[PDB]
Design a protein around this ligand. Structure first.
Ligand SMILES: C[C@H](N)C(=O)N[C@H](CCC(=O)N[C@@H](CCC[C@@H](N)C(=O)O)C(=O)O)C(=O)O
Ligand SMILES: [Ca+2]
Ligand SMILES: [Ca+2]
Ligand SMILES: [Ca+2]
Length: 417
């Protein structure tokens, strides 16, 4: 859970609290890209929005609806030995917190829901582009009138339709009256804790940016109904959404390695250092996004951003010796200390000063066929690189790797600008 909170802690209790959740199915990227963009680009000014951006991360990482079965059928009877049992308790505990008032659960769904059969794509069996309640009223909730809240949220979404076919409709599953499937799902659990609970569906027929657009419309519609004041730092249209999903400023930091751009990496990165004796899911990974991770696939390690494959790492596993903190380098004739794990911009040249006990391999530069070379003490320019060794498709970013005996002492990236 990630908090989107006012800067003044005192403002937390001055408006309602919403719990915003997506990615209970790992192949529904509208939902988890929307929670991602919300965390990255919105501000909550009073009250609080608690976000679990992706409920089923292992499944997201494999582009899979649910590796351990349908997580959204696990909110009623559940075997204590179910692999998702701990996850389910975390979620139910967030839902049932006295400080939470409302719950919004995002999904992507096939076709377009219509309450009357129109055709195979538009009918009551379909799920796309609807706003869903389990029943019209939840007595004892802070906001008991789910129906009114839903109708007003649908109004807000329908003020912004990209095409008429995308019109939102109310879907009331009347769950307690015999819907045994929905009785096992998240929002029904929430209403049983006297929370006002809603699900939004964006149609799988839509491109990702349009799915995310509609989820964000639903989030804003509901925040307005709750009177949780918010801002965002962008204009809400599909182009703007696309730009932010595919943002060149997105990065990932694996272990103590430098920040790497998410987009426009080469599809495969060879001889990539990873800490030994460390299970893949336990390798630290930081990002300015909230849906990034690593997953093992055969012998490779995939860098994932939602369902997008950003690169395939071909690792070599090695001790990460943390002793080397900085390296003396010259950049465009300007001498300076460079922290291990830095990215440095270069216009013309660089040079690494020799070090006792430390060997430098500039990846893409060579002066011999030594398999374990020392390339400190060379003045290096762009023309000196074999461009295929670049980290990026643009052939501008190069790895410098440092070794102390048989241990890995760190990496610095140079970016030619
Ligand atoms: C074809 C394949 N079985 C498939 O992906 N079906 C989906 C089925 C649609 C689907 O999952 N809705 C959700 C609705 C849940 C709403 C609400 N109670 C909640 O807890 O948020 C579900 O039932 O968990 C499709 O048609 O979009
Ligand atoms: Ca932003
Ligand atoms: Ca779903
Ligand atoms: Ca080299």
């Amino acid at each position: 859970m990630i908090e989107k909170a006012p800067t003044n802690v005192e403002d937390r209790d001055k408006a309602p609290h919403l719990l915003l959740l997506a990615g209970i199915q790992g192949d529904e990227p509208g939902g988890f890209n929307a929670t991602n963009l919300f965390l990255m680009h919105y501000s909550v000014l009073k009250g609080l929005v608690e976000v679990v951006p992706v409920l089923n991360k292992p499944s997201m990482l494999r582009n899979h609806r649910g590796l351990y079965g349908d997580m959204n059928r696990k909110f009623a009877a559940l075997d204590k030995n179910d692999p998702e049992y701990p996850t389910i308790q975390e979620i139910k505990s967030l839902i049932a917190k006295p400080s939470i008032d409302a719950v919004l659960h995002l999904h992507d769904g096939g076709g377009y829901y219509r309450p009357v059969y129109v055709d195979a794509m538009l009918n009551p069996k379909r799920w796309g582009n609807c706003f869903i309640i389990d029943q019209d009223e939840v007595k004892g909730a802070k906001f008991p009138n789910l129906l009114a809240f839903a109708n007003n949220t649908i109004e807000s979404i329908n003020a912004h339709l990209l095409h008429p076919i995308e019109e939102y409709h109310l879907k009331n599953t009347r769950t307690a009256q015999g819907d045994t499937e929905m009785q096992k799902a998240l929002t029904f659990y929430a209403i049983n804790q006297k929370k006002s609970a809603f699900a939004n569906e964006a149609s799988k027929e839509l491109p990702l940016a349009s799915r995310v657009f509609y989820h964000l419309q639903a989030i804003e519609g509901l925040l307005n109904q709750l009177n949780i004041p918010f801002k965002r730092d962008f204009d809400l249209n599909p182009n703007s959404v696309h730009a932010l999903i595919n943002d060149k400023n997105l990065w990932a930091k694996i272990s103590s390695l430098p920040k790497m751009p998410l987009f426009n990496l080469r599809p495969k990165l060879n001889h990539f250092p990873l800490p030994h004796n460390t299970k893949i899911p336990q390798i630290p990974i930081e990002s300015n996004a909230y849906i990034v991770g690593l997953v093992k696939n055969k012998q490779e390690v995939f860098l994932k951003y939602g369902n997008k494959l950003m690169t395939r790492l071909s690792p070599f596993y090695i001790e990460f010796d943390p002793s080397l903190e900085e390296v003396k380098m010259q950049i465009d004739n300007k001498d300076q200390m460079v922290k291990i794990g830095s990215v440095v911009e270069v216009k013309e040249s660089f040079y690494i000063h020799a070090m006792d006990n430390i060997r430098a391999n500039v990846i893409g530069f060579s002066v011999s066929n030594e398999n374990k070379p020392n390339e400190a003490g060379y003045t290096i320019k762009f023309k000196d690189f074999q461009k295929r060794f670049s980290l990026d498709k643009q052939e501008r970013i190069y790895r410098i790797e440092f070794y102390k005996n048989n241990a890995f002492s760190g990496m610095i990236l140079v970016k030619f600008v």
